[PDB]
């Protein structure tokens, strides 16, 4: 009568149990070493040469460094475009101004604000949450759809008389808010954006619908980034450094595996039909019975 593997696996037990760490020393978790694993019987060999670990460290350095050098690319993009225009930035955002007010101090506050933003960048920032939906498949599909959509010819009166009708209302931007008097920056700002009917300037609002009012505060500064990866940098008064974010100096696969929006597999609790109303999550309870 052959002993089933669960019995002598149960009576085998564990040799040893120890903790390990991540690279950045943020996570401690414990490994388990059963004596009855076939890894014990596989007698596999092991070696750790120093240039191999050095290559591992350089690869990990690049994998960390991707978003930080993207931030540096954004910063010297700002520097190049302020050197480009000569330093006289125009207004893109709808808010009134006062002539009898010294703009030298808000210019100095803008310099200090971009400095403090460079000190306090993050892997979770405005531009990362901006370009994370760009990595999706539907981003490419809707890019093709918009490139055929806006670049569509003027219609003849025949489809005006008999053809079916045609339909881009407001934008979903992200923002960094750097507050110099309290030395606190902001990384994740979700903001709705629109255009005024009377003038082409922008109007920003809360995702609930509340008007965003920080532009009146002179000590603060803001950075806006769009879903099509444009770039604004607004000091108070609505005047905006305007450019695009450069990423050609970064590899495709490093940005693609370092962070990417995730498409889900089907598990318990979700519909087989796509886009149906989701029921309640499984939510295993430490408060109720397991049942």
């Amino acid at each position: 009568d052959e002993v089933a593997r669960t019995d002598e696996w149960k009576g085998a037990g564990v040799s040893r149990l120890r903790e390990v760490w991540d690279v950045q020393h943020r996570v401690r978790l414990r490994v388990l070493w059963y004596v009855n694993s076939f890894w014990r019987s596989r007698e596999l060999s092991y070696d750790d040469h120093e240039v191999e670990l050095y290559r591992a460290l350089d690869a990990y350095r690049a994998r960390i460094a991707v978003e930080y050098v993207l931030i540096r690319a954004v910063r010297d993009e700002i520097y190049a475009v302020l050197r480009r225009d000569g330093g006289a930035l125009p207004q893109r955002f709808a808010c009134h101004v006062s002539r009898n007010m010294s703009w030298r101090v808000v210019w100095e506050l803008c310099r200090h604000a971009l400095a403090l933003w460079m000190d306090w960048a993050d892997v979770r920032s405005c531009i990362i949450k901006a370009l994370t939906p760009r990595l999706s498949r539907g981003a490419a599909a809707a890019a093709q759809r918009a490139r055929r959509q806006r670049e569509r010819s003027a219609p003849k009166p025949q489809e005006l008389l008999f053809g079916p009708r045609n339909e881009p209302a407001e934008q979903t931007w992200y923002a960094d808010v750097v507050r110099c008097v309290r030395a606190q920056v902001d990384l994740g700002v979700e903001v709705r954006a629109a255009r005024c009917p009377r003038t082409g300037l922008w109007i920003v609002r809360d995702r609930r619908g509340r008007l965003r009012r920080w532009l009146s505060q002179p000590e603060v500064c803001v950075l806006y980034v769009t879903p099509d990866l444009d770039f604004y940098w607004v000091l108070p008064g609505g005047f905006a450094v305007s450019s695009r974010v450069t990423l050609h100096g970064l590899a495709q696969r490093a940005l693609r595996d370092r962070f990417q929006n995730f498409e889900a597999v089907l598990a318990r609790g979700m519909h087989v039909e796509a886009g149906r109303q989701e029921p309640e999550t499984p939510r295993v309870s430490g408060r109720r019975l397991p049942f």
Binding site: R30, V284, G286
Partner: protein, 176 residues
């Protein structure tokens, strides 16, 4: 505990295919929140060579090393990069014990023979059990490989921890 037996059996089953040795892990309050643990959907893992960036892509480099050209239409390599990234991740078995316990005592409540060199009484508030598999390419394994770990929740967010495989095998592999 129950995924450990099944994952050991399954990695023994598929060992001819991928040559991945199993790795049973437990995690506690020191890594994730209880709210993150009570509704954690699943966990992903990917073994990355010190020089090879994946095991799902081609071994001798890949065509995704050409840089992203800031293009509107295909953003980053199109969807081919996306389902290559869906191929480069793998799912692991997974259980959550939300009520607190002590794995010495708790593994004594289950029928195992807890045979440790010293009884360091370690206590945790919620024990999540999983088992990954790190890929020795041939029978030989390198210490400079790293192993990544995604934790995915039903909202779609994820947490990313990685660590190089020598740190798991400092005193374990030199013991053999």
């Amino acid at each position: 505990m129950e995924t450990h037996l099944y994952s050991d059996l399954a990695f023994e089953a598929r060992f001819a295919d991928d040559e991945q040795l199993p790795l049973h892990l437990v995690l506690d309050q020191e890594v994730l929140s209880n709210e993150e643990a009570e509704t954690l959907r699943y966990v992903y893992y990917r073994n990355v060579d010190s020089a090879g960036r994946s095991t799902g892509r081609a071994p001798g480099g890949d065509e995704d090393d050409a840089p992203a050209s800031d293009d509107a239409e295909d953003a980053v390599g199109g969807d081919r990069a996306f389902d290559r990234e869906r191929r480069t991740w793998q799912r692991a078995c997974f259980r959550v014990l939300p009520r607190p316990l002590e794995l010495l005592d708790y593994l004594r409540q289950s029928g195992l023979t807890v045979t440790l060199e010293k009884e360091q009484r370690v206590r945790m508030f919620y024990a999540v059990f999983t088992t990954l598999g790190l890929r020795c390419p041939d029978n030989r394994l390198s210490g400079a490989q790293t192993l990544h770990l995604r934790l995915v929740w039903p909202d779609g967010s994820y947490r990313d921890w990685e660590f190089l495989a020598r740190d798991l095998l400092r005193e374990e592999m030199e013991a053999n």
